[PDB]
């Protein structure tokens with residue numbers, strides 16, 4: 001509270017660490033459904049069903065232009081990619097399984113890097 005400060009974690013390396021994790025996700029062989037925005041003119045249903053589209057190239061642009069205030073807002077956008085994927089794809093489809101695999105991959109890197 002006012003003039004009563006908690007100790008806080010060193011956040012000076014957060015930007016570089018998030019960039020490294022995002023590079024690892026960009027180069028994963030199962031990243032292909034998530035590298036660019038879904039084409040809203042060509043994919044039936046996506047625009048109406050998915051209220052907040054997100055993809056790796058959009059996250060990369062936001063990270064490069066100072067649009068994440070902290071590392072938690074970055075992780076929210078990554079998780080949104082995989083939450084959208086589950087909403088729109090059957091678990092046993094190629095895209096569905098790719099999403100489950102990438103979520104698992106991300107959360108381990110996240111835990112190992114920051115927790």
Ligand SMILES: CC(=O)c1ccc(O)cc1
Pocket residue numbers: 033034038043084085088089095
């Ligand atoms: C990411 C995703 O849900 C998705 C769906 C359909 C596509 O043709 C490409 C990507």
